[PDB]
Structures are given as structure tokens and as C-alpha cells.
Amino acid sequence: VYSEKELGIPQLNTVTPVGVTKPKGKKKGKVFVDDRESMNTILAMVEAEKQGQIESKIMRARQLEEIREARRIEAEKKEAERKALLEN
Amino acid sequence: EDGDQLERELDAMYEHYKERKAEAMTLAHQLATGEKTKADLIDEGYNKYAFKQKEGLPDWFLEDEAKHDKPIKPITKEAAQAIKEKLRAL
Amino acid sequence: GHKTTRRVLKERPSRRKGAQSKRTQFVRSLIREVAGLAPYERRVIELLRNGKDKRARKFSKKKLGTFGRAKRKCEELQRIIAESRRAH
Amino acid sequence: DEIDPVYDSDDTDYNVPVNTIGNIPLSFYDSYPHIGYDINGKKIMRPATGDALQNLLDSIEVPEGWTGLTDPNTGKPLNLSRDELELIRKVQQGLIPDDV
Amino acid sequence: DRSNIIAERKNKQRVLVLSSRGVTYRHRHLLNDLASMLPHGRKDAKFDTKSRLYELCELAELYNCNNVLFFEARKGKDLYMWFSKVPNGPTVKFYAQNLHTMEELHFQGNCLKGSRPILSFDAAFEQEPYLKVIKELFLHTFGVPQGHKKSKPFIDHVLSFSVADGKIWVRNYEIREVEKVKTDINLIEIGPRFVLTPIIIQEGSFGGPILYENKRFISP
Amino acid sequence: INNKEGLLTALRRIQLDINPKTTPFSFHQSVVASKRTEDSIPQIEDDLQRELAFMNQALEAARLGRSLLRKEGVPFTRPTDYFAEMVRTDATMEKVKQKLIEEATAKKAAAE
Amino acid sequence: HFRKHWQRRVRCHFDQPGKKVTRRLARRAKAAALAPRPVDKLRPIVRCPTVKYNRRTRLGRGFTLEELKAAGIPRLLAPTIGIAVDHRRKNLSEESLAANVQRLKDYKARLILFPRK
Amino acid sequence: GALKYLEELSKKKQSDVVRFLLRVRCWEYRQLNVIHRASRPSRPDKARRLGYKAKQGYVIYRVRVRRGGRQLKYQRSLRATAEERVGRRCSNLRVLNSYWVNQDSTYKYYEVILVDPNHKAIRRDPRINWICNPVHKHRECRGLTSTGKKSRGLNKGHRFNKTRAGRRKTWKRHNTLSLWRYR
RNA sequence: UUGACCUCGGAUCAGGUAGGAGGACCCGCUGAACUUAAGCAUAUCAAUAAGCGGAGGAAAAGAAACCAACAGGGAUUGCCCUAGUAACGGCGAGUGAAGCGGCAACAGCUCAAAUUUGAAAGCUGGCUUCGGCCCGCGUUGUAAUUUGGAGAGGAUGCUUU
RNA sequence: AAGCUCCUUCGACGAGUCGAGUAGUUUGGGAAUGCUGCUCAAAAUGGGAGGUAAAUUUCUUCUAAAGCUAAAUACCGGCCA
Lengths: 88, 90, 88, 100, 220, 112, 117, 183
Fold this sequence. Notes:
This is part of a larger assembly, with eight protein chains of eight kinds. With about 100 residues, chain D is an alpha+beta fold. Helix content of chain D is about 20%, strand content about 15%. Chain D has helices at about 50-60, 80-95, and strands at about 35, 45, 65-70, 75-80. Chain E is an alpha+beta fold and about 220 residues long. Chain E has helices at about 25-35, 55-60, 125, 130-140; strands spanning about 15-20, 40-45, 65-75, 80-85, 90-100, 115-120, 155-165, 170-180, 185-190, 195-200, 210-215. In chain E, strands 1, 2, 3, 4, 5, 6, 7, 8, 9, 10 and 11 form an eleven-stranded mixed sheet that branches. The interface between C and H is medium-sized, with 12 and 12 residues. Chain H binds two RNA strands through helix 1, helix 3, helix 4, strand 3 and helix 5. Chain C: It comes from Chaetomium thermophilum (strain DSM 1495 / CBS 144.50 / IMI 039719). Chain C: Keywords: Ribonucleoprotein, Ribosomal protein.
């Protein structure tokens, strides 16, 4: 029993995509979510994990819908910032 | 002649004796999910018990045939969950 | 290998140990016409009469399990259709 | 004659979904606003959000076509049509395999 | 229009993958791998060897398939592959020798089931004539038509063909994007590794005149 | 027996026109390597060099097709937002993960 | 290869001379029954199938119908005079047919047949 | 010829008339007991080819047996089970043979041909005195009937290397350690 | 009213049959675990031990839907060899045949599928002066002929009881 | 009554059984090694098993779903020696 991070196990292209992967040991990129909307998205996912099991289908659906709205607002703000950068 | 009286007696005796004494949801799931289509449904509906007389036959014999004409089709836990949720009342 | 003169052997009576006699052909066809058709045979008959030869072949293969058996059964059903047309 | 490579009306793949998503369980895309990608590569939104009153009414009296299955194409649950329900009833009873 | 290709000019191509009555489990696994990889194809098994090749042709006509991939197992030990352009197209026989299927845990590669591959053809497939024919048939077989909507849209795997001695070698790799250091490709093997010795090329659908005979084939 | 003329006429009957002038890479989706790769493989038996030569040829074809796909604008990068069916099972992915973890644990445990 | 109970499944050969003398007494008893007749029936000369033993020949099961007819011995009467008959075998070669015909002719020339009752 | 026509009917047993007859007879068999006596067979052609004779001492018994799994499958066939039940029912008779006669969604139906060994017509008939001999006691119990041979794999070829001469006997022969005097 | 045919039952009617025992060897069903792999889970132990049913002096198997690629062999069975080969396998532990060849012994047959149709020629029982009289079975098929390296039917001329 | 020879005459050969899909069990044996259970369900120039790259499934060898049968073989049991 040893930590997978220490173990040099390469990522594998399962159903969950690997996407683009950083070269090993050289300058992992930094992405900021300093935006309040991104804060709210990740915080809402954290609170979803905190709540966990719920006995109401309606409550589960509304939780999912709220955090989906979180991603939607984050994506809209990212698109607006991309448009602003293209203008500049 | 017509046998109506004797059939009446047989049915009355059968009623007196009676007084004295998942598959559908699986098929619905297979139709809903892109697994089996209409042509496949009729193809599977052409079974060994197809063209079973059911209207002009006596009730007791029809009940016996209904007891012993059940084909065993595979079932799924999803279908079991669906039927449990359907049968769950208020 | 070795050079030996081959002989001509007598025809074994075990050849054709199935059926090819006209009497058995008569009996088989008469039993066909007295007994009728199975549900799937009648389904394929309807398909062939409507003209869906491909659909009939596929259904026969699905019911039988072998391409050769499907082709053969389509053949008997086709001559039955032709004979019924001639009889009418 | 040269074979024209066309789906027939009886083919298994005669109608295939636009979602392009395979046999994956629906546990994925629950948190994502879209359902998969199309041929061109554009994601497919959820159709709409169900009303609380409508959901409560459905739970109290599930519709005739209710199956408890989420549509692979759209976020709304998949519901069987009246013709499909009649087909299932005919298959279950065995009284008429083919009409007319 | 139900040819199920949404494209400007359609590449109507279809593959019927057929197996024989005595195929080994390794060969069935290979059949499953190519069936997963080929999304315009139909799987079918247990063709009687006592039947006829033009009977395979009516089978392909029944399935409306313009290409057929036939797996003939001899001795239950040796694979024979037939690539045929169904209606009146020339057919190629190869012998498959060395077999490695996707289910082995030493590949460490995975891709989309049906996504379009990068067809990586060797140069001999570009100079040599019977290799011209093999390249054309292989392109038509693994062509994965343009607007065919039973395919996923993002390219992530490479199907590479390469002859070394006189034998076609097939490789399947996954493209992995890693950003460049102040993004390029690493290929990681996925699956079917099967070694091909060409044997014959006939002009007809499954018969017809013989045009190439590989006069270096030593049979098991 | 090698009837080159007949091979050419049969390929003429078969041929689907493949011209970069006329037909897009999005259609034909084929890359022809300039090298024969039999020079790249010195000896057939040497598995490492054979795999490296196939790696090189496949990589060159992949880069060429990638450049053509940018030239055409067709999407090429499968996003992290996407989940779809794999050609092999997530169970197989879990098993290969287990094997890799076991090998690594054995190695650094031997070091320990 | 002693994973199992060879202790319970070991069987010895201390009765070898006993079985030998029993077999000798059995063939002597057969001779006493068929006192003037030979103990074993005449058998044809056949060839070993496999390539490793082609050049060698051995004894068969019984003579072929064509060989019997050529030698002039009836099918129904040959077993009564002690000739094994095999209906399954076929000649397929004039060499083997002639060899078996010569063997049967030698048997006829060396055989004395008694006149029924 | 009538037996040939009956054989053709049994070949096309899924036809309309045969399906109707098996339906009616299945209802009758369900109404009767699990085991019952037939003086005359339901399929005379099949009985005749299996060996039934129009003699005093030959009887048919019709038996219904539960079908389905025992996921452990019961290695003895339902035919063998029916024959064994017939043996315990009438231990006096000898099981000549058996043949499937009908089937249902719960029961499968067999007819067994049985021979009386103590009747002197059977003793006299030299084609049946073999089953009159005492070696054939409870052939159904020892697996000596057709179903027994089929389940024991008593066939020739490389496909039946392990069972052509008896599974347990072959195992013993292969696992005996033979030691000669002069080793 | 009467008499059949079919089916289902009763009789302390007449004649027989099945238990149980034994189980060394034999034919089936069912079926473990310890152990080994210096841990253990697949595997092994083992298609074994226990349990259940069924015979004989032997049982079983047995006259190819076989072996084979031969210049062919020719029911089954047992020994030697094939051979620790092929083949399979946490490819570790390990498992593990068969053809051929030398032998011992050697034996082949009965049916269903045919119309005796110019003659049910077949068989059970009880009644006997024991020689031949009935009753019943049976045509929804008992005798004779025939069983596919065959045969039938005529003609034909030899040879056997 | 029987064996033959000849022929301008005939020559019937075993079905929920093969086979396909599938679960269990078993084997050295996914051409599923054999078997059992479930669904479907055959053919008559037929069917089975093999040979073969040789150019199309050519060629070889047998007839499954009825049955009998002594001898060579095992034997801690029975009657003895």
C-alpha cells in the first residue's frame, strides 16, 4: 500500500478522458478560477459532496440543477472574457 | 345437443370447487432503450403458444392453459426496480 | 509415394443413405399438405408473398441458425407458393 | 449489379440516435448541462427543466408510458408511445402477433 | 434517403465480418476487436465450410454489404483472411500467423469505439502494384464513411500498416496530446496485433482469374 | 504469376478518386509515408527496433494528418467535457491499473 | 507424480507365470475341442497405414469379398473352414488383392476337408 | 406405409394438426396422474421403431416429470428420471425403452416401453429372451438405456477418448501404478 | 329394450413378480475438506473420501455417423510402447492423453422401415382320456422374408438337408 | 425349405433428434472435450467427422438419434485348494 502520486503510474484513457497531460516534472501550468462564479461552481460541488445522500428525488434534482446553473454562469463569463481578449 | 346445460353444470362445479379451496417491464425496457424494435417485437411474439384459442373455450380449461403457458424470458434488475417503484403505492 | 495400380471399386450400397426415392418424396409432400405450416413458416410465406425476400431470409436464419437451412426452407416455401398459384 | 449500401427498413441500425453516445450508463452528464456531442462536434443541451408541481403529480400518478428511464437523447425521462404500449400489450397477450 | 451518411459526397461502404465454423477463441476475440473498431460493419458467425464463396456473395447481398471480411480457420490453429469487394470486385487472401487481441493487459492503450482512425499506409503500398490493390481494399474496408452517424466524431487512434519482409504488419495506437515545453503526440499501442502473409489476389468477387500468387509461402 | 496489367485495370475499376486538389483529407483520411521502413528495420527478430520503426512511421502519419485537420478546421482534440464508449471495458482499464500499481509497488518496495 | 493415492491404486504382477500357464491351458482346451482343426483362423496379409511403417506388412482382420471370390471360396462357407472374413476392408490395389489370393490358394492347397457327416 | 406417414408427421410436429393434437393430449395428461398405463402407444411409429411389440407382456407407461434447473444442472436427463420413476413404480417389468411424447411449460411427458420377463411368450420369443436374462435388471438404474448411453458418452472417436470405455474405469486404469516383477 | 366398441375400476378369483442381504471387483447419481503452491483465493487434492440407487461371476464396452492421408487399416477389451510427447495451465505449483506399432483374445448378429393378401400361416390361458378341444391376445399388425460394404422379384441351372 | 449365377424390374435405412444461441458441470482439448438444463428448431444429389493456400471449399472416410452378444480384463467378498 503506497501512494499513487509517488508511484510513477501513467494516466490511462478510460471512459473519463485523459485530455492533454503535462510533461512530467516540468512546469505544470497554472489556471486561476479567481472569478466569483468559478468559486461558486467548485463550492457548490463541494457542498454536493458534503450533503451526499438525500431521500428526495426533487431535492436531488434541484441540487443538480443549481450546480448546473453554476457551470452555465461560469461558461458564460468565460465566453465573455474570451470575447474581450479577442477584442484586445 | 348444444351442450349448454352440461357446460353450465361443469362451470358451476368448478366455481364451487374454487370457492371451497417483471417480464412485461423487461420488454418495455428493451423497447425503450435502443435494443429491440417493432419487427423484433413481433418476431419474438411469434411463440410456440401463438394462435391460442381463448374466446370459445371453457373457463376452467382456459385457466389451466393460462397457468401452464408461461414462457421464461430473461429479466433485469432495472426492470425489477421499475416494477417495485410502479407497485409502490401511497 | 509408391506406384501401385488403382482398381475400380464396386458402388457401395451405403451411398445416398438418406432419401432420394419418389415414394418418400410423395409421402413427404402429402404430409406437408395435410399438416400445414408452422407459425414461422407461415410468417415467411407471408413475407415472400408480399415480396420481402430479404426479410424472409433473415427471419428464417434467425429461427433456424444456419444460412444453408434458411436458404433451403425458403426454397420449399417458394415452391409451395408456386404450386398454390398453379393450383388456383 | 452493384449493391447499394443502404439500411433496410428491417435493419437493426435502421434508426440510430443523434446523441452519438454509446452504451454508457447515465451516471455521466448528470452534472453537465449538455448530453454528449453530435457528428459536427456541438454539444446537445438539456431540453428543459421539469416543474415541481408536474414532478409531484407524476410521482403521485405515474403516466401510462412512464418507465423510469432517462432518455439518452434528452434529459427528460423516456416515455413509451401509445403504439409502443399497444405493441407490448399484444406481445404479452399473444392474441395477435401480426395485424390483418 | 436512408443510406445513413450525412455528407456532401457519400462514401457508401459496408463491411460484413464473417467467421467460420472452427474459429479459435483468439480468432473470435480478433473478430470482436475489428467489429468494435469498424462501425459500418455487421458481425456473423458459423458459415459452413461446405458452402460456396459465391454463397458468401449472396450472404453479403442479403446484408446489403459491399465488402466482406472472411475468417477461415484451418486446423483450428491458423487464420485465413479474405478481403472482398462484394459485387464484382477483386479479392485478397492473406494468412494470419501471430495474434494479439485487445484483451491482453500489456497494451496500455484505449480509444473510442468507432471513432475515425488515422490510416498510416507504408510506402510499398504506394509503389508496388499488388500492394496498390491491398491498399485500395484496406482503405475501402477500414474507411469509416464520412457522414456515418454510428461513429463518434473525435479522432484519437491510428491504424498503421507496414510491410517488413513480405508481410503486412498492422498496428493500432492511441494519440496522446502533451503540451510542448517552452502540444505533440505520443502513440500508445491499444490492441489488435496480427501478422499477415499475403497469399493470393483474384480478379473476381470470390473466384475469377488469379493475378498474383505469392510464391514464397510456407504453410504450417 | 504476377499480372501487373490486370492488377492495374482492376484497381482502375475499384478506384475511389483520392486527390488533395479535388478531395479533402476529411474524406480520404489516408497518409502515405515516404520511407519504406524496411530500411528502418535492420533485423526482423529485434522486437524493440521493429516497434520503434512502426512508432516512427505511425507518428509521422499522425502529425501529417493532424496538420491537414487544422488546415481543414475539422475538430481533432477530444475534450475533457466528453465521455463516450471505449473500445475496451473500464474493467480492463481497472485491471491494467492494478497490474501497473503492483509492478511499481514491487519495485520501490525492493528498493526499500 | 505421486500427488494421489498410488498406495490405494498400485497393482502388482506376481501372477505372471500363473496367467501364462492359464493361457497355455486355455489354448490347449481350444485345441482339444477343435482337435484336428488349427487353433487360430487364417488371416490376410495387410499393410501398416502410417508412412513410418509402409514397407512393413502384418496380419489383418479378415479376407476381402473380392479376394475370396477370386480364390474360389464361398463367403458363407469360408468361416466354416476357418477363414476370417472382413466386410469392411476394401482391396484398392491389385498387389494386395493378388497377395491375398495367393495366400488363400496356398491355404486351399494345404487344407484337407472332411465330407460332412 | 402408415408408419412412414406418421414418421413424417413427427418430423413436422410443429404443424397445425400435430400442434392441436399435442395440445389436447397435454390437457388430458395434465388431467390424468403423474404416472399411468397405456395399452396402446400415442405414437405407434415411434414405439415400433423403439421396439414395442403387439404382444402380451409389452406395456406403455406415460409419465410427466418437472422440467427446469435443479445454477447446478441435474446431469440425469428428464427421460432417465422418468424411466427410473417407472422402475420404482413397476419394479417387476423391465424397461425396454422410452420416447418423448409431449411437453408443457411445467412438465415434460414421456412414454416408456416395458417388457414382462415372467410371461412365457416373452420367454419363448428369442428376440426378447435377452431382456428375460437376469443381467438386465434395472437398466434404467444402471444407465443402460439409450439416455444412459448418451449421457455416458458411449461413442467412438477422439471426441470420446475419456468415456468410450467407461469414465471411472478409464480413470482407474490411467491412475494405477503397475509394477512388474522385472523392473 | 337389447348387444357391441372404447375407457376407467372392484374381487381373500388363477398364475407370477419387488423388497431385504451382500457390495472385494462392477454401472450410474451426488459430491467435500485438509494439503501443496514455505502466506492464499484460480488450480491442486479430486471428476477422490462420505451418502444414494442398481447386477453378475464377472460387470461394463462392443460390431464405426471409427482410425486415418496410408502402397492403407477395419467390433470391443487388457499389457508394453507411444510418453511425461501433443495439448492445457495464478505458463508457478503443475495437469496430461490419443493414432500407429508388438502382443493376448477374437464371433458375429436381431429389428423399424414392404402387401401373406391366393387365405394371422402367430401367440396366452384352462380342459383333458395327454391326442387335441375351446377361450382370449391380436389387423392401431402376431408368423415367414429382409437390415445398405446389403437385399427383394423373376428366369436360370448346379449343389445341401 | 436353402446357397448361388444372370437381369429390357425394384431397392423403403431411426426427429424436439441433429443444429444455433445460452447457464452449469467436466476434460489435455471453444473446431465448445463430453454431458445436462432453457429458447428457437432442421435436411433429403441428405448428414457426420476429417484433408487442403494451391485457387474453391474440389478431396478422403463413415452412416447418429433402436437393440443383443462369449474371450482375452478387475476381484480386501463366497465354496475350496
